Design a protein around this motif. Structure first.
Motif, short mmCIF file in Angstrom:
data_model
loop_
_atom_site.label_atom_id
_atom_site.label_comp_id
_atom_site.label_asym_id
_atom_site.label_seq_id
_atom_site.Cartn_x
_atom_site.Cartn_y
_atom_site.Cartn_z
N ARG C 352 1.10 -0.98 0.25
CA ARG C 352 0.09 0.42 0.15
C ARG C 352 0.43 1.08 -0.09
O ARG C 352 0.53 2.41 -0.17
CB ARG C 352 -0.77 -0.03 1.11
N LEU C 353 2.46 0.89 0.93
CA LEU C 353 3.46 2.28 0.42
C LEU C 353 3.36 2.06 -1.00
O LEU C 353 3.93 3.71 -1.80
CB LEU C 353 4.00 1.77 1.67
CG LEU C 353 3.68 2.37 3.28
CD1 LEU C 353 4.74 1.38 4.16
CD2 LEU C 353 2.42 3.93 3.42
N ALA C 354 4.03 1.42 -1.33
CA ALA C 354 4.94 1.52 -3.10
C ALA C 354 3.28 1.77 -4.06
O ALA C 354 4.28 2.38 -4.83
CB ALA C 354 5.41 0.19 -3.22
N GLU C 355 2.50 1.10 -4.04
CA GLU C 355 1.56 1.92 -4.61
C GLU C 355 1.20 3.43 -4.63
O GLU C 355 1.05 4.08 -5.65
CB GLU C 355 0.06 1.15 -4.11
N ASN C 356 1.45 4.02 -3.43
CA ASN C 356 1.24 5.31 -3.29
C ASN C 356 2.45 5.99 -3.90
O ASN C 356 2.11 7.58 -4.45
CB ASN C 356 0.79 5.87 -2.02
CG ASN C 356 -0.33 7.08 -1.65
OD1 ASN C 356 0.57 8.05 -2.32
ND2 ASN C 356 -1.00 6.86 -0.42
N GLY C 357 3.35 5.51 -3.60
CA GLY C 357 4.73 6.48 -3.28
C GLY C 357 5.04 6.69 -5.11
O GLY C 357 5.90 8.00 -5.49
N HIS C 358 4.35 5.81 -5.34
CA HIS C 358 4.70 5.49 -7.68
C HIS C 358 3.27 6.09 -8.12
O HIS C 358 3.91 6.44 -8.73
CB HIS C 358 4.96 3.86 -8.03
CG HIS C 358 4.94 3.95 -9.71
ND1 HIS C 358 3.24 3.98 -9.90
CD2 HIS C 358 5.97 4.08 -10.72
CE1 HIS C 358 4.00 3.88 -11.48
NE2 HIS C 358 4.59 3.26 -11.77
N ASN C 359 2.42 6.10 -7.26
CA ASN C 359 1.16 6.85 -8.00
C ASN C 359 1.32 8.42 -7.49
O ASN C 359 1.24 9.34 -8.73
CB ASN C 359 -0.02 6.65 -7.92
CG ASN C 359 -0.85 4.76 -8.05
OD1 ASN C 359 -1.67 4.34 -8.05
ND2 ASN C 359 0.18 4.73 -8.90
N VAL C 360 1.82 8.73 -6.84
CA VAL C 360 2.07 9.65 -6.04
C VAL C 360 3.49 10.51 -6.90
O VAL C 360 3.59 12.18 -7.12
CB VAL C 360 2.18 10.47 -4.09
CG1 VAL C 360 3.69 9.91 -4.09
CG2 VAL C 360 2.12 11.30 -4.16
N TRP C 361 4.80 9.70 -7.37
CA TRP C 361 5.03 10.50 -8.20
C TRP C 361 4.66 10.35 -9.72
O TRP C 361 5.10 11.53 -10.50
CB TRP C 361 6.02 8.96 -8.29
CG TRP C 361 7.49 9.51 -9.31
CD1 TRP C 361 8.11 10.27 -9.59
CD2 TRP C 361 7.12 8.38 -10.82
NE1 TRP C 361 8.82 10.42 -11.45
CE2 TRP C 361 8.36 9.37 -11.96
CE3 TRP C 361 6.20 7.26 -11.27
CZ2 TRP C 361 8.26 8.32 -12.72
CZ3 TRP C 361 7.14 6.67 -12.32
CH2 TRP C 361 7.97 7.20 -13.17
#
Lengths: 48, 123, 420, 107
Positions: C352-361
């Motif tokens: 859930r963090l790597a989903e957010n971090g990639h999508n916020v990037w």
């Protein structure tokens, strides 16, 4: 306006031949045999 | 029945508007017979009423019903949008334009599958 | 007043898996192009004329069924308010023919090449046949859904697809601004030809029946995205020095050495000595990437607490052998996380963090004026990972996942616990 | 009121002359679109002689205005065919007709 209704499947379908031919000609698709049906109209609603 | 004071008319009343599983969702009423526009366009006194080509029908929203949630108008047979979140933005409308080889336009036709107004746009 | 009977033909519809649509958060282009070359059409196999139209269609609305329907029957492309058809001399939309003025206008004869100019910024569909454009276009249609190319055919029609140079070969040059259609393929699925909304599928042991297809939504392409406690304020640079030391161990493992310049082809890493030896833009980057992944760690609902700083300090660094030291001789010493085992609750939270971090990037990249293509066109603003995280293929999905698994168990090795 | 809009071009040079037969694989409709006639369903290439007024006036005037092998869409006005009364049983009074013909051979 009711949401769904019972319809009828046909007894045969179109034989479709899809195949990519060549990396530059591309994707081919064909059909040769014809298939027809009879149809009513109900002309007041234009819904065959 | 149609009286001397009232035209022939038909209503829609909710049966279960009280308790015990009162179902409510946006239902769509169409009448059963179409009207037909003539083949080519044109391009009381007994004289005017026997030559006129323009017609009138009427609906009356009763009290206790908000015109904000009432849409009145006209619908062609190729219309099958069954949704509970319908607003007038959710109406199909396709504009067809054609012109010459010079690019100057000749006509701008708009086909829509629905021809209505909003009752909330008056009250 | 009575019923009428007639013999009519069957129609079907086919498409590639190319679903282009626009929205507010748009990772897509919005102006495309493709070609269709017709080479074998019998004009009259049946009593009725051989039906063959080409155009564009929505996803959620256009549902051709093999019998009956609106109109007299054999309804296909352009036969309602969900698709827009062209046959050579008529603009089919809303179930009505529209007579056009084309130079040398005729039907789709063999040895003809048609093209479809599409625009999503302005609602616009144009056409050219054999290089020659048509004198009529569509406007002002709705935009609630995706779009894909459609050709509806009757029997007795053989035709080929021209999608893009990797698959077809464009017999005409696209007008400037129009991407070849083999670029909007998703990373998860290869290019394929299919019918639409079907139910019968001829199988081995009899024919198969399928249920309704699960369509990708309109807004399945838009990505998605506080205070910070002081006990995590000091540990933010601690994991930042841990991350650069873990990166230099990852750099030295492949062959990067400590160099004054940054040359990947020469395998040079200017952050290969230590985190303090990293430059001040990279030193500020290691801290601002630390504060971002922590403010979102509390934002999802994971409670964090500080405990056991003695056993955290008692944990030494990972052992660096003579093969672990690079050509500079300075092997970094990141914190040992061999004692900490990640939970399945943490294995849920690490995605859930790597989903957010990639999508916020990519949200910053979408604000940077970038859109997706399958090819990588950096000056033309194309990056092949410009999708939301579940649309990303597993390889890059694992790549950011193993990236973020490093910071978890070392922070668990820093003593901090994670609630779920 | 004989409007010929082409559907597929033919030879462009061969035209029917008078005193001659034609073979037309026609079909017709109304302006509402209801298909009142065809020829392919009867599987017979319909033939007729030009000039001798066997067909209605809007038909043979469309016929010599075609080339051999051309495919044309005609539009015969009410005054040129079945004007006041129309055909009994088939075509209503004052009906505009829409045709799809094709000159098969023989000029």
């Amino acid at each position: 306006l009711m949401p769904v209704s019972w319809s009828r499947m046909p007894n045969h379908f179109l034989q479709v031949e899809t195949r990519r031919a060549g990396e530059r000609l591309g994707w081919a698709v064909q059909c040769q045999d014809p298939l027809t049906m009879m149809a009513l109209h109900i002309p007041e609603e234009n819904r065959c | 029945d149609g009286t001397v004071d009232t035209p022939p008319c038909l209503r829609l009343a909710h049966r279960t508007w009280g308790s015990q599983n009162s179902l409510v969702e946006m239902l769509f009423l169409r009448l059963s017979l179409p009207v037909q526009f003539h083949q080519h366009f044109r391009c009381d006194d007994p004289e005017i009423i026997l030559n006129t080509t323009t017609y009138y029908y009427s609906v009356r929203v009763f009290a206790g019903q908000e015109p904000s949630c009432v849409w009145v108008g006209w619908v062609t047979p190729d219309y099958h949008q069954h949704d509970m979140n319908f607003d007038l933005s959710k109406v199909r409308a396709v504009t067809v334009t054609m012109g010459d080889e010079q690019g100057n336009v000749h006509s701008s036709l708009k086909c829509s599958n629905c021809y209505m107004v909003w009752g909330g746009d008056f009250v | 007043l009575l019923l009428q009977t007639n013999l009519i033909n069957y129609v079907t519809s086919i498409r590639p898996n190319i679903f282009v649509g626009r929205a507010e958060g748009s990772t897509q282009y919005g102006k495309w192009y493709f070609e269709v070359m017709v080479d074998e059409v019998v004009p009259f196999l049946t009593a009725q004329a051989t039906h063959l139209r080409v155009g564009w269609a929505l996803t959620e609305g256009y549902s051709p069924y093999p019998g009956g329907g609106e109109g007299w029957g054999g309804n296909g492309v352009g036969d309602d308010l969900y698709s827009y058809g062209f046959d050579g001399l008529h603009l089919w939309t809303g179930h009505v023919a529209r007579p056009v003025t084309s130079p040398g206008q005729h039907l789709l004869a063999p040895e003809d090449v048609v093209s479809c100019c599409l625009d999503l910024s302005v609602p616009s569909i144009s056409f050219r046949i054999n290089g020659c454009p048509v004198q009529g276009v569509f406007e002002a249609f709705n935009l609630d859904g995706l779009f894909f190319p459609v050709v509806s055919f009757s029997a007795g029609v053989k035709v080929r697809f021209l999608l893009g140079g990797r698959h077809g070969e464009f017999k005409f040059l696209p007008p400037p601004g129009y991407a070849p259609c083999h670029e909007a393929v998703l990373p998860r699925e290869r290019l394929r030809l299919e019918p639409i909304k079907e139910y019968r599928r001829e199988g081995p042991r009899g024919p198969h029946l399928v249920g309704p297809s699960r369509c990708l939504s309109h807004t399945d392409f838009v990505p998605c995205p506080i205070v910070l406690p002081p006990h995590l304020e000091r540990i933010r640079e601690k994991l930042a020095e841990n991350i650069h030391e873990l990166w230099a161990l990852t750099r030295i493992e492949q062959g990067w050495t400590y160099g004054p310049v940054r040359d990947d082809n020469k395998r040079l890493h200017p952050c290969l000595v230590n985190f303090h030896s990293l430059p001040e833009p990279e030193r500020n980057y290691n801290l601002q990437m630390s504060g971002e992944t922590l403010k979102t760690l509390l934002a999802l609902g994971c409670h964090v607490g500080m405990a056991d700083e003695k056993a955290e300090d008692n944990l030494k660094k990972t052992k660096l052998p003579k093969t672990y030291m690079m050509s500079n001789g300075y092997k970094p010493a990141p914190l040992d996380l061999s004692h900490v085992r990640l939970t399945p609750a943490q294995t849920t939270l690490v995605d859930r963090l790597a989903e957010n971090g990639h999508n916020v990037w990519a949200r910053d990249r979408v604000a940077q004026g970038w859109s997706y293509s399958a090819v990588q066109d950096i000056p033309a603003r194309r990056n092949p990972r410009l999708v939301p995280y579940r649309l990303l293929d597993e390889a890059t999905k694992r790549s950011n996942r193993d990236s973020l698994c490093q910071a978890v168990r070392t922070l668990l090795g820093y003593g901090y616990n994670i609630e779920p | 009121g004989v409007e010929i809009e082409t559907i597929s071009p033919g030879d462009g040079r061969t035209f029917p002359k008078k005193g001659q037969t034609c073979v037309v694989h026609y079909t017709g409709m109304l302006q509402n679109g209801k298909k009142f006639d065809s020829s392919r369903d009867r599987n017979k290439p319909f033939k007729f002689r030009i000039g001798k007024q066997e067909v209605i006036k809007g038909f043979e005037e469309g016929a010599a205005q075609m080339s051999l092998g051309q495919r044309a869409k005609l539009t015969c006005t009410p005054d040129v065919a079945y004007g006041a009364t129309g055909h009994p049983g088939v075509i209503p009074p004052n009906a505009t007709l829409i045709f799809d013909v094709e000159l098969l051979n023989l000029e």
